[PDB]
Amino acid sequence: HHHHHSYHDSIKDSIKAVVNISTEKERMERALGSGVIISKDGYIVTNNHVIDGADKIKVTIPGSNKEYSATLVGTDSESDLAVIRITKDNLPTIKFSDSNDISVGDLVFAIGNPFGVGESVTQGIVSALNKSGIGINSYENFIQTDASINPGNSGGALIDSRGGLVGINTAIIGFAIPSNMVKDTVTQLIKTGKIERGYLGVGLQDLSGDLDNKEGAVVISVEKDSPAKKAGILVWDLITEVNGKKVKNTNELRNLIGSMLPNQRVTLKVIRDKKERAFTLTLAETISAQNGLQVEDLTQETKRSSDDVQGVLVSQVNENSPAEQAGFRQGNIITKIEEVEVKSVADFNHALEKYKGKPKRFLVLDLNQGYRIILV
Amino acid sequence: HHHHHSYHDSIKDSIKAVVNISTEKERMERALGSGVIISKDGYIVTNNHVIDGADKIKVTIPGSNKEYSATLVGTDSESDLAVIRITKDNLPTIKFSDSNDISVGDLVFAIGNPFGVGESVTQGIVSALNKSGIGINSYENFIQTDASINPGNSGGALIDSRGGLVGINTAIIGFAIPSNMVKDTVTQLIKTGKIERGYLGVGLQDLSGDLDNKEGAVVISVEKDSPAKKAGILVWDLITEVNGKKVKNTNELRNLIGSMLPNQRVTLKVIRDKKERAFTLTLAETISAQNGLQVEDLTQETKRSSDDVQGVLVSQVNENSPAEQAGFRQGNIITKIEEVEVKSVADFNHALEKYKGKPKRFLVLDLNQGYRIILV
Amino acid sequence: HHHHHSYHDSIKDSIKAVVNISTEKERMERALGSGVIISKDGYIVTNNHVIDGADKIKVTIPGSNKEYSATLVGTDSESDLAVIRITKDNLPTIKFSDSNDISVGDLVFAIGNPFGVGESVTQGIVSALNKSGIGINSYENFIQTDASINPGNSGGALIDSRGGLVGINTAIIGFAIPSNMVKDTVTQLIKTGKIERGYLGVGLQDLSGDLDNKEGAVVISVEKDSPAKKAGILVWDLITEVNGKKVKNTNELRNLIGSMLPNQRVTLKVIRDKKERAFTLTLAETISAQNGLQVEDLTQETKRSSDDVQGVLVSQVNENSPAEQAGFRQGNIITKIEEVEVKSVADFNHALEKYKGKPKRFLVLDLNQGYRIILV
């Protein structure tokens, strides 16, 4: 049999479908990561974080030497998935395998195209299969593997011994997003350009020593003009049940609400203390631009690296750039531009279109040495 | 053949026998490590260091959802092995393979149960086989492997391609204790609750530039009321032979004396300098409790992390615990409790039973800012 | 088939040919690395950096217990290869495989002999095959692999599933020098004791924002009494072509000049700015000694760790050595010895032969606290 000595014939066709994704051995990085071709039309799947800090996305296909510009079809930050599009025909495509028919001990190979100058393949097994308790993806097998997963092959393919895609490599002993979930996500992203999720409007924490005397999710904040606000949910409410089913923690509440649609009607059990109250309400419901300055929104993750700051965070400033001698550094926060108060990346971009090339005043905060004005 | 594509059918039965061991995806750690079921009676083998800092040992079996309390059958700190017991019948058991019939290049898989929510399996080969020169375990193959060995699977199983146990994973490219040694050790531990070893009573160092003009073990300390003390062995004695066989270094002396029984008669050749002298003598011969404060004895390893300190070392103090606001920190040393002078963990425990719940005065040393009194 | 359960029979003969290389489990390091026996005459191949800081090279063969002194047949620092010789017959030799007939996904095993007390083998696949654009080794496949490559097995063997050498392990997910290149290099090193390469005499940098308005290599320095100096090449010359073929960068210029012989005639296109000029010229054209003090030449790599320093760098000084109490430290620079001005290791050695054992004055610089005189 071929596999006594090599797996090359089993994986060679899959290798053809794993592309590199870049911006702007050796110098060619500037490399963002890998992607996988899924349709002959030119659709490619990758991680969200691979293309997160990049406009002008460039794709390198095995045996091409030519970079193709890609446009962002859609993103899903919760699943860390994204679909981009290039204009070309008769492309090699990956063949999907059923990710619920894989077992611990199956041979798998992780394929990446780290720099657009060839593939890199690592060999291992399915080490563990992890099903979350809850949500629309309750029974999806998230894949651990001892095939090396790394930023080189993040966004690339994780294939079985017959060359079928069982997952999308995700780097941040190795994790892969299962291929059934990937198929469904890319189908929703080619349509609709997004994943529509319900939104309640509450910040959440778990119970430690409160006797509330139950389990559930403690409401620590109620966003203004939200369904939770308009329904009458207050801070310190313990959300215990959704539609008559208990939520043990904020994880289950998050995934059950997120598995629901916008404008969908939902009912919640809450403990003020300790009188059960019932609420019935309608559910409601952030990529940034690059340049040489980049910015990003202050997500709860971002302000961790700080509440109540408003505006964008200048994530990185490359050296000797036309925006570094202006005065921009890393970790600053753009709070005002001329007459537009910057509270998010959208405000940033709207301010940028108005009066571009014209003189422009930024009020930008530094955590140390602070508020300074930059005339760009 | 099955192994062209997967090893699952070959390892699935072995996976059933690898349990998780815990105390007190996600929160469930509090995880100590893995263990292996070896008898249908309910005996489980693991590393000593997995259960070292834990009373109230809890065991999670694959496909159970129910934690079973385990009692400590026995420990062996030199071999880093331990046997615990749970009350259950018709358990799945591991099948042992002969660890002296394995070869470099054999396929092996390391199985752990890191958090009690499923197995984790890594694949590799036997990378190296290491036999020590000396002792009762002279010809046991200690196993290196490029199957990943880590705290997740430490104490778990290392199996061959047919699912037979070839070793017990040990984390501290991967090391495993051979299965023949494990079988013998667990057999001695189910009986006797311990591994009986002879004790001489000397601290030892090797030769560097002494011309003693030989090889052997330099005696740097003679413990009081020990066979070496009562036989007339002095500091700076060079122990060169045991029962007419040369010892090259303190390693060989350690393993030859430790391979002997308590109350066993032994003869030693020594060089005062350089007149050979002969001694004939009878050989002679430490787990701690937890709580939220833990303590441990000051082993020669422990005071390295300091001679001549006496008493326990408070290894860790968890945050916001009822014993942290008392004043206990990490790295302190409890030297006195009321009228009991604490010289070991046994003194600590004996002091604790007397007057528990009653007011209690600790004299505890800090390496900086030092002696302080805590009224618990 | 054998490979469903083990690869031992396929690799056992290759393991016999992988030796350990040392100087001067446990104490036996003092270990430099691994090597591979390639001829029954006693020729062994290894990395240059394994034997770089060592005279008195000792070789341990599997199943020997006897160390054999080795003499340095030849070195090639650019390819990080070296050939040494021991006196013994009927040795086990490695069998070469064609390194241009390997594929990504082929099974490979990395064999080392890290401490001379047995082999260590790691398993993986060919992860990537990397061909440089240019030079005599344009089409040699440099091998990446997820078989672990590490200082233990650096200089050892990388073999296919049939036991044939496909590369020499190189540590500094794992890199191996292809076996065809290794065969050619060792053949040139057994003859000639070296790899003869052409030399131009220019320091080089790439283009960033110069509009030169081309691609090529910028000359930043012209060594005195060199072919470039005598031909009339000046600083800031842009070397664009060699023998009518364009060089994109200093990498291509380096490899095309280095692929040429000493005394070979070559023509170059240069841009002063922007008038093309043509030059035609003849091409022209460093291991150190150890002791307890070591020294090395100030290569451009070495002064990075500083231009224009002249003399040797004392790389390391072992503790309590007869040369440490003299005053030698790490990072100092020996600039003068008695009447010999030390500008390289050759000057160092020539100074050492004159008046050895006689009183001897070193003028040695320290980057801090600086010039001090040592009377050895």
mmCIF file of N, CA and C in Angstrom, chain A residues 2-9 11 15 25-26 109 117 119-124 147-148 150, chain C residues 1 3-4 7 103-107 123-128 130-132 144 146 161-162 173:
data_model
loop_
_atom_site.group_PDB
_atom_site.id
_atom_site.type_symbol
_atom_site.label_atom_id
_atom_site.label_comp_id
_atom_site.label_asym_id
_atom_site.label_seq_id
_atom_site.Cartn_x
_atom_site.Cartn_y
_atom_site.Cartn_z
ATOM 1 N N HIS A 2 0.329 2.355 -0.512
ATOM 2 C CA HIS A 2 1.099 3.587 -0.636
ATOM 3 C C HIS A 2 1.519 4.136 0.723
ATOM 4 N N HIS A 3 0.685 3.968 1.750
ATOM 5 C CA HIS A 3 0.904 4.635 3.030
ATOM 6 C C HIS A 3 1.955 3.963 3.905
ATOM 7 N N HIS A 4 2.548 2.848 3.471
ATOM 8 C CA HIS A 4 3.676 2.312 4.222
ATOM 9 C C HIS A 4 4.886 3.231 4.139
ATOM 10 N N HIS A 5 4.960 4.067 3.104
ATOM 11 C CA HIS A 5 6.159 4.846 2.833
ATOM 12 C C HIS A 5 5.842 6.322 2.633
ATOM 13 N N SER A 6 4.624 6.635 2.201
ATOM 14 C CA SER A 6 4.313 8.016 1.867
ATOM 15 C C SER A 6 2.809 8.241 1.878
ATOM 16 N N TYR A 7 2.426 9.492 2.131
ATOM 17 C CA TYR A 7 1.048 9.945 2.002
ATOM 18 C C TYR A 7 0.881 10.933 0.856
ATOM 19 N N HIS A 8 1.903 11.085 0.011
ATOM 20 C CA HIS A 8 1.906 12.155 -0.983
ATOM 21 C C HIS A 8 0.764 12.016 -1.983
ATOM 22 N N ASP A 9 0.537 10.803 -2.495
ATOM 23 C CA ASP A 9 -0.506 10.633 -3.503
ATOM 24 C C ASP A 9 -1.888 10.899 -2.926
ATOM 25 N N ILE A 11 -2.613 13.218 -0.652
ATOM 26 C CA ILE A 11 -2.781 14.609 -0.246
ATOM 27 C C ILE A 11 -2.414 15.598 -1.341
ATOM 28 N N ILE A 15 -3.425 19.606 -1.659
ATOM 29 C CA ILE A 15 -2.408 20.654 -1.575
ATOM 30 C C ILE A 15 -2.656 21.731 -2.627
ATOM 31 N N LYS A 25 10.839 33.042 2.163
ATOM 32 C CA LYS A 25 12.157 32.858 1.543
ATOM 33 C C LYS A 25 12.362 33.709 0.246
ATOM 34 N N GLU A 26 12.417 35.042 0.361
ATOM 35 C CA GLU A 26 12.178 35.790 1.605
ATOM 36 C C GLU A 26 11.556 37.148 1.282
ATOM 37 N N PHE A 109 -3.734 15.528 8.182
ATOM 38 C CA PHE A 109 -2.602 16.354 7.787
ATOM 39 C C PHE A 109 -3.068 17.798 7.698
ATOM 40 N N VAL A 117 5.123 30.598 -1.563
ATOM 41 C CA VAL A 117 6.219 30.006 -2.320
ATOM 42 C C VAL A 117 6.223 28.498 -2.103
ATOM 43 N N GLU A 119 3.755 24.793 -0.408
ATOM 44 C CA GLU A 119 2.956 24.265 0.685
ATOM 45 C C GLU A 119 3.840 23.835 1.851
ATOM 46 N N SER A 120 3.212 23.709 3.018
ATOM 47 C CA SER A 120 3.830 23.099 4.189
ATOM 48 C C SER A 120 2.795 22.194 4.833
ATOM 49 N N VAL A 121 3.139 20.919 4.993
ATOM 50 C CA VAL A 121 2.214 19.894 5.454
ATOM 51 C C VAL A 121 2.775 19.267 6.721
ATOM 52 N N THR A 122 1.941 19.158 7.747
ATOM 53 C CA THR A 122 2.307 18.456 8.969
ATOM 54 C C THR A 122 1.354 17.291 9.196
ATOM 55 N N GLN A 123 1.877 16.227 9.797
ATOM 56 C CA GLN A 123 1.164 14.966 9.955
ATOM 57 C C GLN A 123 0.840 14.717 11.422
ATOM 58 N N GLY A 124 -0.349 14.179 11.679
ATOM 59 C CA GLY A 124 -0.708 13.756 13.016
ATOM 60 C C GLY A 124 -1.975 12.928 13.031
ATOM 61 N N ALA A 147 -0.930 17.070 14.663
ATOM 62 C CA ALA A 147 -0.403 17.761 13.495
ATOM 63 C C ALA A 147 -0.221 19.229 13.845
ATOM 64 N N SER A 148 0.955 19.766 13.547
ATOM 65 C CA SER A 148 1.274 21.111 14.001
ATOM 66 C C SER A 148 0.370 22.145 13.337
ATOM 67 N N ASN A 150 -0.215 26.284 13.250
ATOM 68 C CA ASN A 150 0.641 27.425 13.498
ATOM 69 C C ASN A 150 0.201 28.568 12.573
ATOM 70 N N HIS C 1 1.796 -5.994 6.886
ATOM 71 C CA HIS C 1 3.051 -5.295 6.630
ATOM 72 C C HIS C 1 3.660 -4.820 7.951
ATOM 73 N N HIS C 3 4.954 -1.969 8.775
ATOM 74 C CA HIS C 3 4.741 -0.575 9.149
ATOM 75 C C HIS C 3 3.366 -0.298 9.746
ATOM 76 N N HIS C 4 2.487 -1.297 9.848
ATOM 77 C CA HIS C 4 1.249 -1.074 10.583
ATOM 78 C C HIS C 4 1.510 -0.880 12.069
ATOM 79 N N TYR C 7 8.310 0.769 12.638
ATOM 80 C CA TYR C 7 9.275 1.079 11.593
ATOM 81 C C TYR C 7 10.672 0.592 11.950
ATOM 82 N N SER C 103 9.070 13.504 -1.887
ATOM 83 C CA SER C 103 7.844 14.270 -2.039
ATOM 84 C C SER C 103 7.326 14.690 -0.675
ATOM 85 N N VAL C 104 6.583 15.797 -0.657
ATOM 86 C CA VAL C 104 5.886 16.200 0.556
ATOM 87 C C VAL C 104 4.885 15.119 0.933
ATOM 88 N N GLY C 105 4.939 14.672 2.184
ATOM 89 C CA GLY C 105 4.117 13.577 2.641
ATOM 90 C C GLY C 105 4.840 12.252 2.764
ATOM 91 N N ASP C 106 6.069 12.150 2.254
ATOM 92 C CA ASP C 106 6.875 10.956 2.475
ATOM 93 C C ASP C 106 7.200 10.816 3.956
ATOM 94 N N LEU C 107 7.132 9.589 4.461
ATOM 95 C CA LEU C 107 7.570 9.326 5.827
ATOM 96 C C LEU C 107 9.081 9.482 5.942
ATOM 97 N N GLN C 123 9.888 10.719 14.351
ATOM 98 C CA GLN C 123 9.127 10.352 13.165
ATOM 99 C C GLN C 123 8.335 11.546 12.648
ATOM 100 N N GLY C 124 8.271 11.683 11.327
ATOM 101 C CA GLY C 124 7.425 12.686 10.717
ATOM 102 C C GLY C 124 7.290 12.486 9.222
ATOM 103 N N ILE C 125 6.964 13.554 8.496
ATOM 104 C CA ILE C 125 6.891 13.527 7.042
ATOM 105 C C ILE C 125 7.766 14.639 6.479
ATOM 106 N N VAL C 126 7.998 14.574 5.168
ATOM 107 C CA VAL C 126 8.506 15.739 4.453
ATOM 108 C C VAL C 126 7.406 16.792 4.429
ATOM 109 N N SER C 127 7.637 17.908 5.119
ATOM 110 C CA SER C 127 6.649 18.970 5.243
ATOM 111 C C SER C 127 6.716 19.961 4.093
ATOM 112 N N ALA C 128 7.919 20.281 3.627
ATOM 113 C CA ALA C 128 8.083 21.226 2.536
ATOM 114 C C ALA C 128 9.420 20.968 1.865
ATOM 115 N N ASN C 130 12.187 23.080 -0.518
ATOM 116 C CA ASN C 130 12.532 24.465 -0.811
ATOM 117 C C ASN C 130 13.742 24.499 -1.731
ATOM 118 N N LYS C 131 13.545 24.992 -2.949
ATOM 119 C CA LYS C 131 14.624 25.193 -3.907
ATOM 120 C C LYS C 131 14.965 26.674 -3.983
ATOM 121 N N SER C 132 16.235 27.007 -3.766
ATOM 122 C CA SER C 132 16.657 28.384 -3.964
ATOM 123 C C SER C 132 16.594 28.734 -5.446
ATOM 124 N N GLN C 144 12.128 20.622 4.929
ATOM 125 C CA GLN C 144 11.449 20.825 6.198
ATOM 126 C C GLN C 144 10.707 19.545 6.558
ATOM 127 N N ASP C 146 8.304 17.623 10.068
ATOM 128 C CA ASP C 146 7.802 17.693 11.434
ATOM 129 C C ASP C 146 8.350 16.573 12.309
ATOM 130 N N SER C 161 11.515 5.969 4.597
ATOM 131 C CA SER C 161 10.935 4.775 5.195
ATOM 132 C C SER C 161 11.681 3.497 4.831
ATOM 133 N N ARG C 162 12.585 3.540 3.855
ATOM 134 C CA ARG C 162 13.402 2.389 3.497
ATOM 135 C C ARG C 162 14.816 2.481 4.059
ATOM 136 N N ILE C 173 9.874 23.919 11.552
ATOM 137 C CA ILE C 173 9.569 22.752 12.365
ATOM 138 C C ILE C 173 10.654 21.684 12.180
#
